[model samples]
Target: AGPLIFVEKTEPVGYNEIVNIKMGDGTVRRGQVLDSSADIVVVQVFEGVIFTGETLKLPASVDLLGRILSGSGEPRDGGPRIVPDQLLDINGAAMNPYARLPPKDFIQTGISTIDGTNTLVRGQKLPIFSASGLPHNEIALQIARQASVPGSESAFAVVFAAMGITNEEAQYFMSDFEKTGALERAVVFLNLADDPAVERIVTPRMALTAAEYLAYEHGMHVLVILTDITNYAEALRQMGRGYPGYMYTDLATLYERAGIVKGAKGSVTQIPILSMPGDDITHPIPDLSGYITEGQIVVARELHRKGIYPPINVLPSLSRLMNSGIGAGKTREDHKAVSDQMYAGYAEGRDLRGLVAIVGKEALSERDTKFLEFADLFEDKFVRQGWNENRTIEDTLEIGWQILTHLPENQLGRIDNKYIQKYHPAHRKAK
Candidate 1:
């Protein structure tokens, strides 16, 4: 490892202490001690390129927020370096699992596919799974702006790692950051697709570091959205030049950094968008990401071909943290069961889709006809929406209920009876 330098004749160096390796130009390069014996120590070096002759300095935690950094921590935006407020290692201080607060608040992404069903909670690492040439980045940008935590605001922030980004998307992010006033408090890490694999490897660390600062120190709820992990993972593949059997652990390093720590005011929620190589969920990165993340948002080529703008396939998508985030107090009273019923309806329609294609609708029962119709209904209104439409939680729920109301009440198996009567239009008119 070029980054790891073993030095001889050293003091009993403590772990993570900044080893200031004095360089030729009379400037200092910082390294952190990873391990030490009485005689020698291993130093992880090259914040910038390093030379021999070293002095170790500590107590320098740096501040990070509101500036764009390159793949490494060097400031990429035309701005001065962050004034060192608290120089914590980007590797992070170990967070105790016992000290982690459960993800509890409902995060509204304004897309019913998310808001109504796959409810994102603060502090959860819920990734988006997409394949090559899908509209995954578009959805990423959409979620970046549309997201809100009702109980938290200013407060609400996004840390973006724009790795291997398309040029217009880059230009689009720059302009919108200014216009959306996200420019004021936002932290971004920019990388070009042409950038080396090694640079892509560090992009998430800088973004994650910035997120950690804002979440714990400033006590602001932060959403970190890093695009296309395949780019980053391919960098990993390049580094080891092997399958790297511990990839699960490697990805856990990035994904585990997300969540709400106990006694901390704000949370770090992660949406790491990964391109599934060949759309196969079984591929190493997607498989590992699936295991590490709480749940995922899936973009379907099936939906895109049908003309759905955002193309989220709600059936396979989920937020495992959904339970603690919804219901009477968090979103709306009917949110839980209405979403359940919506899923049931959509599932039924999707199940019928393949069967109907073979057996033909003429042979199908009237009930199967309703299931197919409900699928189209869910697709049109719930799944498909204006790209810029930012629906409220209330409207997200309302739209879900509106679709559910059209289906046979008897078919609403996942829902509670009270809600069906409460939100069902036919029941309201009868009463």
Candidate 2:
């Protein structure tokens, strides 16, 4: 139990004011009051402090209870107050696994590298695992402009939130959306490097709320895009350091708010993009995020530097929920097999490329040499796809098979021989 003090609108308390809160324990730390009824006082508790709704007297001021956080949910400038909304329940009941229908529809981004191998789907939560200084922005914009979901053409909408972007980068996104005419159909929340950290937190929530409104109430298919969640996590870290106990639990609360409501007319799909600091997937932010979200889109900086367009180092990238989202009627008949073979072949090529660089190409056997060539071709062809160019499922599979030809016939372990015969790269004789 804590001490209570009488609070009145004596000085004509206005909204969003910090009031001196005297607790039962006799501590008088200032609390940011969110609402004040005729006699009651509702203030934001200290960082991570719990409020069980015990009776409290009104203080003289009204302060919004929440702070601002970036797209990653980090506090940007300092802390800002948010008008109190319903408190989010962190540990809510999940939709039953059996009640959930398998997501069999594939979302085509017109990007061959992704559509060909790593397919995305509607009503799915997919994160693009990108590294610092990569082309995630271009890819994100391309996806926003080109992605199509079935059954909601007339009611499709996108919610994009970017954290810690520069003024120039913000303009880039706006320009891309304008050029593609996606702005009218999209709601953008921008938190630049100069914005308050508290605003970042508000930006995404604001975006998500609008998405929930569009999807559930308006019956529109909504795609929610939040970038650089790492920034959001860092905000929590800093806040935790300043005022303890508000770490993971609070983070989970914000993330859970993004989930789709069970009986809504339309679906809310999330594509939260984050940067893996130092290329470490095990970094606390991504690791915790992996545990929370359905799956991720891991990008490879090394591959990008080596000129792989999407820089999707196939080996580490995974879509855990992909199995439930792909196959026969969903994508191509060969999506599963092609994905498997592409990953295997890409992995083999990666190994061969390293060996060739260490020793010499002549040191490799005929089989090893074939793998080396396939690695080069796969990186040059399959992984390094062009931006603004979208590849259909048919085109993507055709290209995958084309690169498979560079590998030995015996080594085509993941691909069905039937597919190889139908779509393998044509063997053109050298001059």
Candidate 3:
């Protein structure tokens, strides 16, 4: 009836063995064998450990297209559904150690702060680090609606798994899906805040299993967006005794599940959104995730307070595989140059702001003043975009050039002279 359960007749039960414990009140509760010894078996209840017992069956697999499931993999949207395709384990198969192909090819989120700055490449594990009051949910929903491969027209799908979210948030997700018709191309798994904490543990795995089926088996590009993983990490703290020296590997079991399988026509890209406690980036959840994932998209509260739509702080945000996905024939010839120039100019401007605050703006040099202007324009124009706006890579580049025009010719030091001649707004106009 509590945390500990002693089963008398145990010949041999494996650790983490899935079981259905039937309560004395005639209700079946999902549980796992926590500890299994020759004499006694300890079972931890997912719902609640009542005084009783039940059955054991493997996780079911069925067509997940346009369907909604709970954290437990049961149909939450009400459907008898179709026959099984492959009755696989809910924990998912480990990705082959040698079969991993490094992330390449860009996955456009249609956000300037992302596409133009920290580009999300296919098969990459890019997470969004947001605070409690931040609009990460809005950003996540926007990406679900707008994210796409630049040229490939193959079946691209989104597997959205939200854990420990509120009822209002749940309503917003469904409403956005319904309004934008995104649900047609998506498979959603939602574990609400009120749901059993243990149930939240399986939500991401269930979602990833569906993503793997869609991506590896059916040959579709699958983007899995999981929100509030911080909650899931707390749940991990509760269940850590079973896994010693396995947190990184267990997380990799999920994050590493995203990538291109060798010879597969499709790939699975992940964008896990975790809220930093007290906006602390050094927190264990995001810290450990940073090790496994390629890079991060950091949402800034300072920019958000300024009324910016995305508020993505480009300083900390980065895509390690960005080089492989952009420049030359991939995005644009000037993509690399423009991005470099933009980053340099913005960085200098941000740095100069502190100096300007100490010694008034009137005391700054002409060049410093220009950099300050560029910073303001960068945040106001380049970083800020409408919530519904879906800017193409070309649009993002042109906007980059437009923002750079505010600075004089000589200040464009990060760009090559050839690229400046090719893409610089003033240089292009002179032609």
Candidate achieving the largest TM-score: 3
Clashing pairs in 1: 60-87, 61-86, 61-87, 62-86, 62-87
> For candidate 2, what is the TM-score?
0.71
Compared with the true structure, what per-residue lDDT tens digits does model 1 show for residues 122-172? 888888888877998888877877888886543777888888766676778
Writing each residue's lDDT as its tens digit, candidate 2 over 199-277 gives: 5544555556556655654566677788867766654443211222444554554455544344534566777777766
Ranking by TM-score: 3, 1, 2
TM-scores for the candidates: 0.81, 0.71, 0.83
Worst 10 residues of 1 by lDDT: 53-62
lDDT of each: 0.72, 0.60, 0.76
* Models ranked on lDDT: 3, 1, 2
> What is the lDDT for 251 in model 3?
67
Q: Pick the candidate with the highest lDDT.
A: 3
Model 1 earns a TM-score of 0.81
Question: Candidate 3 on 1-431: residue-level lDDT in tens?
Answer: 22333343234566677666544335556666775434434466564433344321114343676777776666777776535765444444333321357878878889999999889988888899888789998999999999988777557889999998788888888889878888888888989887766667677877877777777667778899998778777655554223234455556657757787556578888899878777344444334554335788999999999998888999999899999899876789888888888999999999999999999999999999999999999999999999899999999999999989988888888788998887787768543
Q: Which parts of model 3 have CA positions greater than 4 angstroms off? A: 1-32, 35-63, 94-98, 239-246, 279-287, 290-292, 429-431
